[PDB]
Structure 1
Amino acid sequence: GPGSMENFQKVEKIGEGTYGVVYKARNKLTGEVVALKKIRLDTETEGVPSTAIREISLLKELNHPNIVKLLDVIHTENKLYLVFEFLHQDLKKFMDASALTGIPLPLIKSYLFQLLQGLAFCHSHRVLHRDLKPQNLLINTEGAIKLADFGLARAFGVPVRTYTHEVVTLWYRAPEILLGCKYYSTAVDIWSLGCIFAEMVTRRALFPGDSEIDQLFRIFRTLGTPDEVVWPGVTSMPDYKPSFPKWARQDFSKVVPPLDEDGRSLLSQMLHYDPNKRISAKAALAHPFFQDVTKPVPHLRL
């Protein structure tokens, strides 16, 4: 942790999380543009927040060109400063302002492929993200996109144990979490990424529910209400109810009309009800959808 605050000049506010604010800053000696996340501990009467403990411990060992890099951690008695690689924008803001007639198919393909690389790296290092959504995907000027905000992430064991429920921002939350399932796994990250894929194509959330049960219903009405055939166990799940309306699965070409056969193929596999059949990030990298991606691989950071 060789950093000192004396060496940074703050440039402007760029955002605000739970325990503080993010500034774009400049390293006065090297020239490097960073993002500083401040986490005040003086305010904290419960010592160093668990979110911050997980973020730091987990980001330490996740070095990957598609994961935002933690460069340093400064620890005063009253303040904690996470120094990150700086990326100019998030995917949500890019979709809102610049993607008005859409994201080109090339760029969507590139972004999706990089997100999968990042996520595969997380799972390979026993980290669930648990909050994949466009706000938490940072993009640079060079065409890279990187997983960010590991405040909700967690180190899993194999097999997994019961972790915190109702995780993941609702619109991006997987069926198994919505149904109160005892255990969840890497498949919850894929579901999110699937929702994100659709979203990049349409520029609107695929399942914009306003409650747990409304979220389920929206999913059911889009992919059909799952039964024992499509998803063994579903009806035995803690918050599964027999009274659930039985919606027929509409044809997948209707879910995201502009999408090609390869696209539809991959999307369906990301949005498979059964977490056991849902495609892994590792397998998805080989999907035909990506055959014509050529964007040179982003470089690691030091």
Structure 2
Amino acid sequence: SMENFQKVEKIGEGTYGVVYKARNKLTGEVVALKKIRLDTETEGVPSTAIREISLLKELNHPNIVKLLDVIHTENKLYLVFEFLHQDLKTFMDASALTGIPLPLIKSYLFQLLQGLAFCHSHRVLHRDLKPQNLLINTEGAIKLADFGLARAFGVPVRTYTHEVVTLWYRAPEILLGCKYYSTAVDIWSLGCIFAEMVTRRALFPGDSEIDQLFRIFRTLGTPVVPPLDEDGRSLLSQMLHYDPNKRISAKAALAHPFFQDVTKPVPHL
């Protein structure tokens, strides 16, 4: 089963399981392996694994991480993914003193919205957009990862799980416990990440739910990013609109004048 894979190093722990860097001994391919324990006497295959796998098998896009294989054993499930060289959070930290060039920020946002628009047009909400879950390679690409908190949504949506999105990236409609939420929640997260790429610090780093809400109302007003030009500010304000319906969709965001001159720069690693 796993005979052909040599573990190189442990990468981290996401919503569930553990991710390792591994190499295929026969092809030379370097992969990320997600190891998933199965509760064989109690609860079985976790719902997070069921959702991530079923949905990732549908979502084939350049800006969504590729699931290559699922390896079954009696007691473990291993997901074989393409390996990306590092996460956006690590990149930003390494760039804390020198900053990230605007052409790169713009390219990254463009690609993320492409991946997100693909998700949303395929009735999938990600629900965990944070720089830790966004992976970059040495050739200018960025991709959506860790679909452990994702789900398939209905048209129209019904009430879904409230315990969703890390605090810092959580949209006002979640923080106020609105009955319904949808695709707008992911755009909010992306709006926060856009701001964080430009400053290299989190936009709304709340210490609690109330602190989170106050930080949002402080910055936006009751229902920002100096290095950013007029085109950038306009897009950012549309991604951080208070009203979920008024908040821009990923599709419409791609047609924004901010992206008129977007290229694909290679990052500095």
- Which interval holds the TM-score relative to the shorter structure? over 0.9
Rounded to whole Å, the distance in 2 between the matches of 1:97 and 1:294 is 22
Q: How much is the aligned-residue C-alpha RMSD, in angstroms?
A: 2.6
CA drift of 1:23 comes to 1.2
- Which secondary structure does the structure 2 equivalent of 1:5 belong to? coil
Q: 1:19/1:264 Cα in 2 relative to 1: closer, same or farther (>3 Å)?
A: closer
Q: Deviations over 1:188-242 (max 9, x none)?
A: 000000000000000111111111111111101110011xxxxxxxxxxxxxxxx
Q: 1:297/1:181 Cα in 2 relative to 1: closer, same or farther (>3 Å)?
A: farther
CA drift of 1:100 comes to 2.1
Which 10-residue stretch deviates more, 135-144 or 93-102? Answer: 93-102
Query: What percentage of residue pairs aligned between the two structures are identical?
Result: 100
CA drift of 1:62 comes to 0.3
Structure 1 unmatched ranges of 5 or more: 227-255
CA drift of 1:30 comes to 2.0
CA drift of 1:294 comes to 2.2
TM-score (norm 1): 0.85
Q: 1:174/1:85 Cα in 2 relative to 1: closer, same or farther (>3 Å)?
A: same
Structure 2 unmatched ranges of 5 or more: none
Counterpart of 2:101 in structure 1 is: 104
Note if contact 1:19-1:40 (Cα within 8 Å) is conserved in structure 2: no
Which 10-residue stretch deviates more, 163-172 or 19-28? Answer: 19-28
> Runs of at least 4 residues of structure 1 off by over 4 A?
296-299
From the CA coordinates, give the structure whose radius of gyration is larger: 1
Q: 1:6/1:197 Cα in 2 relative to 1: closer, same or farther (>3 Å)?
A: same
CA drift of 1:175 comes to 0.3
Q: Aligned pair count?
A: 268
Q: Deviations over 1:49-98 (max 9, x none)?
A: 11111111111100001000110111101111000000010000000113
Rounded to whole Å, the distance in 2 between the matches of 1:166 and 1:274 is 20
TM-score (norm 2): 0.95
- Which secondary structure does the structure 2 equivalent of 1:74 belong to? strand
Note if contact 2:138-2:267 (Cα within 8 Å) is conserved in structure 1: no
Q: Deviations over 1:246-271 (max 9, x none)?
A: xxxxxxxxxx1111000000000000
- Which secondary structure does the structure 1 equivalent of 2:11 belong to? strand
Rounded to whole Å, the distance in 2 between the matches of 1:12 and 1:212 is 36
Rounded to whole Å, the distance in 2 between the matches of 1:147 and 1:166 is 20
Rounded to whole Å, the distance in 1 between the matches of 2:267 and 2:201 is 27
